[PDB]
Structures are given as C-alpha cells and as structure tokens.
C-alpha cells in the first residue's frame, strides 16, 4: 500500500468533498445508499404522465 511517488494522489471523493464544500453544498456522504425503490425511471414516468396531461388539456 506504499503511496505513489511524484505528486501524491488525492482520492477522487476527497477532491469532490473539497469542491462541494467550496460551492456551499453538502459534502460527500460516504454512507448514503441507493434508492432501490421509486427509481429515477418511475419518477420520470410520473413527470411524463403529468406533462402529457397538462400539454393535452393546455
């Protein structure tokens, strides 16, 4: 596990933590799980149906 030479590498999630905190958003969770239920596809489908209705009965 010897650290590399040249310029010591920074873990990508550490870099993202610093970047996100620089912009005021919350830092990396490192413990959050996935949304197994109610997936992105389901959310998009709901948006699709309401968009279809609103456009139809504009």
């Amino acid at each position: 596990r010897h650290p590399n030479y040249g310029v010591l590498h920074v873990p990508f999630l550490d870099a993202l933590n610093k970047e996100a905190l620089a912009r005021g958003k919350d830092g990396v969770n490192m413990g959050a799980e996935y949304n197994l239920v109610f997936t992105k596809s389901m959310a998009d489908q709901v948006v699709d149906l309401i968009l279809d209705d609103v456009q139809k009965r504009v």
Binding site: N4, Y5, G6, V7, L8, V10, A15, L16, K18
Partner: peptide, 13 residues
C-alpha cells in the same frame, strides 16, 4: 530520485 510532493491543492476536477 524517490521524491514525493505532498500538495492536495494540485488536484484538478
């Protein structure tokens, strides 16, 4: 020649 530099600000994303 086994030189290492510790500078976390040189990362780029």
């Amino acid at each position: 020649e086994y030189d290492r530099v510790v500078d976390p600000s040189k990362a780029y994303v």
